[PDB]
Amino acid sequence: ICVNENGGCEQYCSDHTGTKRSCRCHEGYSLLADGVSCTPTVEYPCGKIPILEKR
Amino acid sequence: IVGGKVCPKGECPWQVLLLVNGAQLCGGTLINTIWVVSAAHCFDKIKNWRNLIAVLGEHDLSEHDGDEQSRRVAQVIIPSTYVPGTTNHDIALLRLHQPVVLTDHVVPLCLPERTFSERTLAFVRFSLVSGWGQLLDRGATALELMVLNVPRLMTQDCLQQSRSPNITEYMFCAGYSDGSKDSCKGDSGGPHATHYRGTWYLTGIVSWGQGCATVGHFGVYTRVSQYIEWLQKLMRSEPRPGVLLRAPFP
Numbered sequence: 001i002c003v004n005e006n007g008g009c010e011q012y013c014s015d016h017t018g019t020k021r022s023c024r025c026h027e028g029y030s031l032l033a034d035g036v037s038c039t040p041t042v043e044y045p046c047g048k049i050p051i052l053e054k055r
Numbered sequence: 056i057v058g059g060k061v062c063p064k065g066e067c068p069w070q071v072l073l074l075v076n077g078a079q080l081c082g083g084t085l086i087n088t089i090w091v092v093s094a095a096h097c098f099d100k101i102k103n104w105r106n107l108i109a110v111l112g113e114h115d116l117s118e119h120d121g122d123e124q125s126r127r128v129a130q131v132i133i134p135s136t137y138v139p140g141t142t143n144h145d146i147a148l149l150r151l152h153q154p155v156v157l158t159d160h161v162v163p164l165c166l167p168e169r170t171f172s173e174r175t176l177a178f179v180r181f182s183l184v185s186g187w188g189q190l191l192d193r194g195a196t197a198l199e200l201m202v203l204n205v206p207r208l209m210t211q212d213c214l215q216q217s218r219s220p221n222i223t224e225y226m227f228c229a230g231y232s233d234g235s236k237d238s239c240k241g242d243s244g245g246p247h248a249t250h251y252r253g254t255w256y257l258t259g260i261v262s263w264g265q266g267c268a269t270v271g272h273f274g275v276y277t278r279v280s281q282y283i284e285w286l287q288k289l290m291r292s293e294p295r296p297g298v299l300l301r302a303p304f305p
């Protein structure tokens with residue numbers, strides 16, 4: 001599953017036994033209930049530019 | 056950086072300036088509040104290991120605006136496979152004595168997981184390279200942080216398109232062969248940052264090349280994806296006496 005289009009994950013992908021796929025996020029992010037998107041849990045998450053994020 | 060533009064202040068918040076005795080040494084990339092990724096060759100001629108400073112939130116070297124944060128470098132970790140004065144395994148992991156405080160101007164770049172970087176990030180054509188290096192080959196270095204957008208090449212395509220050291224599996228080629236745009240020796244250790252779905256990731260390190268923006272040649276970058284596990288394990292370790300540490304690779 002992870003091998004095709006990153007398993008649909010916005011960040012990290014993990015394959016499990018069977019058809020099972022888990023998406024994961026970098027520290028400073030949490031996985032949304034869609035099971036694919038990552039949302040910041042902190043004010044300054046890695047790889048986001050605050051001056052552009054704010055405007 | 057040759058043929059780029061000034062990076063608008065705060066638009067490269069992961070950029071690090073490395074100083075030795077207050078003098079510009081190299082670039083680096085902040086990956087969290089304690090750790091910086093840079094190039095191993097940057098440390099080949101260091102004797103004053105206790106006078107290494109990493110500056111975060113820097114933009115303009117002629118003025119202090121209050122956004123800059125300075126930290127003494129406590130450790131410089133280099134792979135056992137790197138040989139001073141050569142090209143391969145050109146990576147250094149730096150531990151800051153104390154954490155930096157994240158602000159609008161100081162933010163780490165995401166250190167990706169290996170598989171995601173190999174399977175997804177490796178195929179994003181363009182990435183940003185940045186630094187206060189040479190504005191021209193044998194020219195003055197920049198006073199304001201510069202940034203350049205460069206396209207990545209498969210090594211087979213790079214070798215074919217180029218007019219010399221080997222381009223190994225621990226490296227990748229990026230840039231242009233027309234002598235117009237490239238990172239230079241003063242940008243060494245700086246980030247090669249890749250955008251993917253609203254987030255920026257560390258995919259490369261300014262490493263080496265044949266003179267800045269030389270026709271028939273591309274810039275060579277350290278393939279960070281090969282070092283993810285090596286970096287992750289070292290970031291979990293306790294520091295050791297002495298600044299320089301050679302750590303076994305793999």
Ligand SMILES: Nc1nccc2cc(N[C@H]3C(=O)NCc4cccc(c4)NC(=O)CCCc4ccc3cc4)ccc12
Nearest residue numbers: 096099140141238239240243262263264265266267274
């Ligand atoms: N994109 C790019 N395009 C063109 C040229 C470029 C040159 C770069 N760096 C320079 C540099 O840092 N020169 C000072 C230096 C200090 C300590 C050790 C070495 C070089 N190593 C060598 O000279 C022996 C290996 C080979 C090597 C050659 C040049 C370099 C690094 C390594 C970096 C990026 C470049």
Ligand SMILES: [Ca+2]
Nearest residue numbers: 115116118119
């Ligand atoms: Ca300044």
